[PDB]
Design a protein around this ligand. Structure first.
Ligand SMILES: C[C@H](CCC(=O)NCCC[N+](C)(C)C[C@H](O)CS(=O)(=O)O)[C@H]1CC[C@H]2[C@@H]3[C@H](O)C[C@@H]4C[C@H](O)CC[C@]4(C)[C@H]3C[C@H](O)[C@]12C
Ligand SMILES: Nc1ncnc2c1ncn2[C@@H]1O[C@H](COP(=O)(O)OP(=O)(O)O)[C@@H](O)[C@H]1O
Ligand SMILES: [Mg+2]
Length: 265
């Protein structure tokens, strides 16, 4: 049944979940991957069809920006990603994973469940700000609304996106900055967690939600501990136009790097 699957996705964590899809079936979503394999490459919007998505509601039954992504795949990938997670489990900049095997139709399909991710990832934000189209900007509007950058009526303005007709949009974009900067800090933790665990892998923007956690260990190979290496060449470089558009480092002008504290004299 699709309800017992929901109960297992809830797990030991006290979570109230509602299915973003329907009937223990994968939810298909148009996302913004940064991919490179033997056949395809590039920073493009693909259509992912490998994850069952559930949305959490806080009591009072309001839907919040926290999702349980229950990607199902082959068993060897399940075991390998379970081991890589058990190596990287203790890092705080790692999404919470739950590994189980659920009898879907007549077979025990192995599912991995990433808990309390956001709706969009850092790749979606970077793509929305790097491939901007004012006629088709719905992920940028949703990202700005869901993180209290604006009030969802700010887009009723004629040219809200224009930098020279509405300079106030800068003030809106800077409201993402502290959310971006924390993500950066999370990366520096995750890299460390790889380096001390001996895990080699490429860091991509689509494996990090807007909170900052990391959840994709499929193409991570482990070496001797203390000598791993994260490849962050494409991660940081694609992010660079966003680190000044959102003014991510404005918290560095304050004493003790706290936005509430006064500026450094
Ligand atoms: C360029 C980068 C660093 C260069 C280096 O000198 N590393 C030091 C030695 C690595 N070890 C084997 C020890 C090399 C080193 C080994 C890595 C690749 C491996 O196939 C594993 C994995 C297979 C997947 O299908 C696709 C991704 C992976 C991560 C690959 C990508 C990339 O190519 C890596 C990071
Ligand atoms: N054809 C496929 N069907 C299902 N899962 C796949 C397929 N190809 C790759 N995967 C898995 O998906 C992962 C990459 O998919 P991705 O869209 O990043 O999902 P996520 O980022 O949520 O893990 C890889 O680690 C791999 O294990
Ligand atoms: Mg991924």
């Amino acid at each position: 049944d699709a309800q017992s699957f929901l109960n297992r996705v809830c797990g030991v964590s006290a979570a109230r979940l509602t299915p973003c899809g329907t009937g223990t079936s994968t939810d298909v979503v148009y996302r913004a991957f940064d991919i490179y394999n033997d056949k395809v490459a590039g920073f493009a919007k693909f259509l992912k069809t490998n994850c069952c998505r559930f949305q959490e509601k806080d009591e009072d039954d309001n839907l919040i920006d926290s999702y349980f992504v229950v990607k199902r795949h082959t068993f060897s990938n399940y075991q390998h990603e379970e081991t890589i997670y058990n190596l990287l489990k203790d890092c705080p900049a790692v999404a919470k994973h739950d590994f189980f095997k659920f009898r879907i139709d007549g077979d025990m399909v192995p599912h991995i469940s990433r808990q309390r991710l956001t709706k969009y990832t850092m790749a979606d934000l970077v793509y929305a700000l790097r491939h901007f189209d004012e006629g088709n900007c719905d992920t940028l509007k949703e990202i700005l609304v869901t993180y209290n950058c604006c009030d969802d009526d700010y887009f009723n303005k004629k040219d809200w996106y224009d930098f020279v007709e509405n300079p106030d949009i800068l003030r809106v974009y800077a409201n993402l900055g502290e959310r971006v900067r924390q993500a950066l800090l999370k990366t520096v933790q995750f890299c460390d967690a790889m380096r001390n665990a001996g895990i080699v892998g490429v860091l991509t923007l689509d494996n990090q939600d807007l909170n900052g956690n990391w959840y994709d260990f499929g193409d991570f190979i482990q070496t001797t501990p203390g000598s791993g290496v994260p490849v962050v060449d494409s991660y940081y470089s694609l992010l660079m136009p966003i680190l000044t558009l959102t003014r991510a480092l404005t918290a560095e002008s304050h004493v003790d790097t706290d936005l509430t504290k006064p500026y450094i004299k």
